[PDB]
């Protein structure tokens, strides 16, 4: 009974469809990357708020410490979210 083999072939076809879906996702992201944000743009985004503020020395040290670790973490870590949200409050 080659029905199991036919099902395995259908699963392989589904895997090929997943590969095509990944290729299409890359194709879409190629144009979707425009007008987006990244780890380097967020640094100046936070720093421009401090331009017009008379920031005390200790707050400046804390901000520099958080920005220093900001560039080390990746864009998807939960700790990255925690520090980004902390900076969003601290620099506002």
């Amino acid at each position: 009974q080659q029905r199991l083999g036919r099902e395995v072939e259908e699963k392989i076809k589904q895997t090929h469809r997943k590969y095509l879906l990944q290729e299409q996702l890359k194709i879409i992201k190629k144009e979707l990357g425009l007008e987006k944000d990244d780890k380097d743009a967020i640094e100046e985004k936070f720093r421009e708020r401090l331009k017009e503020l008379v920031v005390p020395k200790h707050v400046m040290d804390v901000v520099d410490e958080e920005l220093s670790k900001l560039g080390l973490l990746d864009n998807h870590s939960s700790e990255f979210n925690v520090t980004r949200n902390y900076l969003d409050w601290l620099t506002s």
């Binding site: 200790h58 804390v62 925690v82 409050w89 601290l90």
Partner: protein
């Protein structure tokens, strides 16, 4: 007592915020929560400074006599201290802020029920 607070802010051209502490029981509304906890936010005062975009707004603390128990009354001691406002500490920021320029107005219907540490400040 409540209505004059907005008129004073209009005359002084200061930003205005109304903080109804009466009936409140959660201390976290004043001093916030640590960064570790998920969904943590700073206290009410930090949001006041954030939304007013000024370090010297008019904060109206309504019904100080109706504060709850079981205790934000001790947390107010770090917020209404005539000389300790320069280093008010919020648990989310974990950074002292200078609240000495903020004009605090507190409303109370009866004097006798305010605790002595707050009544003397």
């Amino acid at each position: 007592k409540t209505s004059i607070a907005r008129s004073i802010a209009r005359a002084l051209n200061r930003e205005y915020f109304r903080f109804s502490v009466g009936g409140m029981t959660d201390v976290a509304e004043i001093k916030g929560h640590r960064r570790t906890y998920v969904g943590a936010m700073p206290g009410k005062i930090i949001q006041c400074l954030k939304k007013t975009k000024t370090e010297n707004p008019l904060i109206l603390i309504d019904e100080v006599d109706k504060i709850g128990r079981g205790d934000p009354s001790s947390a107010l001691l770090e917020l209404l201290d005539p000389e300790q406002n320069a280093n008010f500490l919020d648990h989310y920021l974990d950074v002292p802020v200078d609240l000495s320029k903020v004009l605090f107005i507190c409303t109370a219907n009866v004097t006798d029920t305010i605790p002595e540490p707050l009544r003397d400040r």
